[PDB]
Amino acid sequence: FRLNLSVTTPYNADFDGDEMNLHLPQSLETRAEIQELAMVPRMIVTPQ
Amino acid sequence: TVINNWLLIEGHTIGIGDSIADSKTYQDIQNTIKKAKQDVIEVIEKAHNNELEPTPGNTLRQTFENQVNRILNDARDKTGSSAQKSLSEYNNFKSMVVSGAKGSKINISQVIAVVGQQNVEGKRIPFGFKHRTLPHFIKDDYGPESRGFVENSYLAGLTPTEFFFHAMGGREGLIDTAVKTAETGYIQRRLI
Amino acid sequence: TWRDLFYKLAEAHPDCLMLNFTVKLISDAGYQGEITSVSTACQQLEVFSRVLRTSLATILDGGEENLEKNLPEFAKMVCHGEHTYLFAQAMMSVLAQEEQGGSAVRRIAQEVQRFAQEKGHDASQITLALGTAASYPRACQALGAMLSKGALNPADITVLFKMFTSMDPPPVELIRVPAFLDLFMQSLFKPGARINQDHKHKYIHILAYAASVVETWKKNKRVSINKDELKSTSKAVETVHNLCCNENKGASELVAELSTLYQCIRFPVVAMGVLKWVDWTVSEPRYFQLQTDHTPVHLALLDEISTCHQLLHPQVLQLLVKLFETEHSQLDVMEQLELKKTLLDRMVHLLSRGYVLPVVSYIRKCLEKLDTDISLIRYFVTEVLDVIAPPYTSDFVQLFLPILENDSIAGTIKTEGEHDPVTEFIAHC
Amino acid sequence: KNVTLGVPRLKELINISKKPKTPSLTVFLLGQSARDAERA
Amino acid sequence: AGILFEDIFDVKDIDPEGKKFDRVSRLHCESESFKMDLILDVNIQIYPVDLGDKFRLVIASTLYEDGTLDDGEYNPTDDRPSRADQFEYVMYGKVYRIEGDETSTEAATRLSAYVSYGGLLMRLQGDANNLHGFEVDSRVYLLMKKLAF
Amino acid sequence: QGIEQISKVYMHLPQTDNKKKIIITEDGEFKALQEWILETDGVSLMRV
Amino acid sequence: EVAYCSTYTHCEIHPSMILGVCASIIPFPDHNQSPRNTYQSAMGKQAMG
Amino acid sequence: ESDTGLWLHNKLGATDELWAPPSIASLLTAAVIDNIRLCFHGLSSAVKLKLLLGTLHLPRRTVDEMKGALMEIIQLASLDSDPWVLMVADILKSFPDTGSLNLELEEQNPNVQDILGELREKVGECEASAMLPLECQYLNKNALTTLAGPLTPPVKHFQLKRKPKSATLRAELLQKSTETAQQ
Amino acid sequence: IGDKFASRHGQKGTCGIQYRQEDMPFTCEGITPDIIINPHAIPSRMTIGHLIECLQGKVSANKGEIGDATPFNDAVNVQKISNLLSDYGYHLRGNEVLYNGFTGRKITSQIFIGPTYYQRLKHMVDDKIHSRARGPIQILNRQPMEG
């Protein structure tokens, strides 16, 4: 799995043996939900 | 993309040359260490002849420990400041610190100037043996190197006693991680 | 009010001829003081000369107590320009040829010089124009060089010292200027500015000649020379500077030679040097951390300075108030309170030598305004009242009464017992 | 000084317990007693 | 023409705070006729300057003598006449700040125009009479030429 | 003397303005003032 | 030298013998941070060879 | 030079500051003053005053090398209508000769005479407890006495029944120091 | 790429990419790195032993003898190693001038380079890659199996 380094901070990823999980949404409704709520560019600023 | 492609031209590295002082800073660091050693020797001498005024709010041992810790911490801070002064604008540790990418002032100070005092449970190295930390010292020795002060830097290497003391200091971090993970997991689950 | 009306009209209507006539009539009536004066209109000849003369008279009617207040007021209006400053300094030099109290005028001129330097003046060349030092062009130019630079140049000092310690020494007025000695001790007794042991002896000789040498002058002509204080004073300065500037020496090493230290600090110039060295040595807030004695020997040294010499009292008081007004970090609250108690003990020791009024005035000012801890003030008053005896000066009581009128007088007597409370002073008022 | 901050403090605040490790009070003096050390 | 300001300067000082950067040097230069101070950053490596040097400084709104007001994109292939022919050191930047000794009522007698040439800063501080071609957020050429006199 | 389960009381001077006494002056300024405080090692809150 | 003990009874053979098997293959172990020495002692048992 | 009058007025005509503008010596040389001398009657009073005051700050060698033009400028300043320029020229005329200021301010300056007289009266009136020069902080008691009279101890405002803790502290510290030097 | 490698000072990491000899940077001679690691791994972790071992690897390789890194020696320090290295025509601190592999241009920063011991940990990526889409099922609760 290859990913841009800017997103290594939210994941606290390390590139030294770290493993990550990938889930594939199976329906159009679910895919639209992911695209409209949880895409990476939409999570730049945290509410915390 | 743009910065990573310009780095092909500019380049970046780090090496032994980025950890060396100009041989005049080494004299200053050694002088500061000698001053701190003389100071703590003097305080122990005053306690030997019973002149330490007890702090109004702390025990005699507590005020003695506070005095020694203050002296040692001031010595490490002064040595660190001198080390940062010595760094050139071409140095790579300084570049990676001021950029905020990695490292901090304490890392440079420990690599160049001095590792500093080791601590377990917030205190100096306890007397595991009867009235001495290691068999190599004399009983009832509260001097700096006896109770877990490392006077060498990571470049010069640690002597065996302070190597063992630094191992003691490092073990607590792993222990604390191993307990804190499970302690905070239940907190977070209950909050959820 | 109508006079100020007329002045503001003439300001607003300069071309109004009847306004000029009205100003003329106001001048005729004898109220010329109300027309713009002091610092506003000191560019006119008669007005500036009159206002400068009045301010000089005010200073001379001031005294030691008025030194801190009126002198900046006078200095800001005499140094507003190089022409006014030139007139002031020329008149100071003209009076300075007369010693019948002209030492006061010389003091005023020196204070004006140092204020001008604080502002940014290159007034050292002006001062050399004042003195007879300009009669030796080489030495005068060298002094101008060092005082525009502000540093003790070794080659320049060799050039100056060549003319001295001979049968033809330059007039002492060249070497007596306050700026020379002040910059000299700022550069020498400072822990910095390392000297490579070569021309330092020449510096010591120059300082000894400036301070400890006696020159007799009649009608501003050199009469006789006294060189009694040139070997002992020079040796004292060398030993003191060696002790002070060997900063690698520990505290115990300096304490070990306290006998010769006390012998040497019995000199005024040595007293100023050691005072300034202590000022630099304690200025770093880190110094107290490495200070492993609750009651320093530095404080006893300041006590010795205060006791032996009285003309140095304002400087010790200034140091004490500076140390008192600063909060010390990385310490204990109880440690800070103990340090304040020791500082007030030093204040009482200063009060002992007769220097009383400024200390009490500052204590009152810091108490009533910008209230500090009341325990410190009560302890200070307790120490003061137990070391003074009746009768008392009227002004001394006049300034010591308000502090004791309030701020927890009931607690001023807790556990003393054998001796009577402060009320006796009240009975003696 | 000794106040036991960190995760144990958060656990005590969350797990509402009648026996905190280091209970304390922050007493503020009322009047003229607030300035004088002896009158504190 | 597009000549906003022109005068002769002589370099009174080089970087007094120490050499902060290797290839860029700070110049405290002072005027001859209009008596206005200048603070400039120059690329010392390709255009070396030394103390006491005098130079002609011509701030211009455009390089073209007819003032066609070029758009401002790099087109080296241009055969039109230019000012840069008779100048050695030319930088292009924009003015980003104008200070002044303005009061609440009276106008300003002293101005100080700040211009940035992509990082290299220049402050031109003088009487307000000569600084009127400077409007904030406008492009400006330096056109500096060392004088042999 | 004292109140039960009050083992010892520390006398403290807050060097941080958070516990300092900040009083609005007559001219509008805030003028934080430093005043003595006490820190107990027991809890009464009723007799205290 | 400056008298500290003057009454020793035993002398160490070599101080580097305090280390174990895995930790004694680290070159210059006294120039690292101790957690790194621990990590190396862990990862030396997973090296291919 | 090329219209040196405007050059002088614009380099040095900072009328807001009555002080000496910086590097006044460097702006002047033999030729500069040699051109100033024939155009001294066109410039303003402020520029003239700054030039005259800066002529003091010139180095002694520079003053002596080209002292004739300085005498000419001072003489032309004495003929000026502004009384300040008259006074400054009177003061300055003694520089090329010796170096010290002209003490003969008595001529054509009655204001100087009045200020000198009343200052002298006030100084004679207050020769007791006067402001000792700051140099008195340094020179020895004998030197101080020969310079500006001996030291007068401050008035006894009270009686010191017992010494404070300082005296006992200093004695104890002397004893401790005497015992310390032997180790 | 994806396989795991570690130095002898706890500097573990996975291969990010592989470049051919032509693309890698090179010295004045045709020496090109086998492994390039990031500088940022050094400062926060303070494995100065890694740097010293790298420095003395050059001395051991050029001189022709196995270097000594006994933990408490005091006959070996960085200064003597640098002095030995400068006798073989290299910069005394172990830096070299590297040329950019793609453009052939010099790199403005001289690069620290030398021989260091590396190991191949058993955690290869091919032994961990895993995917599923409707595989076997458990018997008790009909949910996808574990492992």
Ligand SMILES: [Mg+2]
């Ligand atoms: Mg990781």
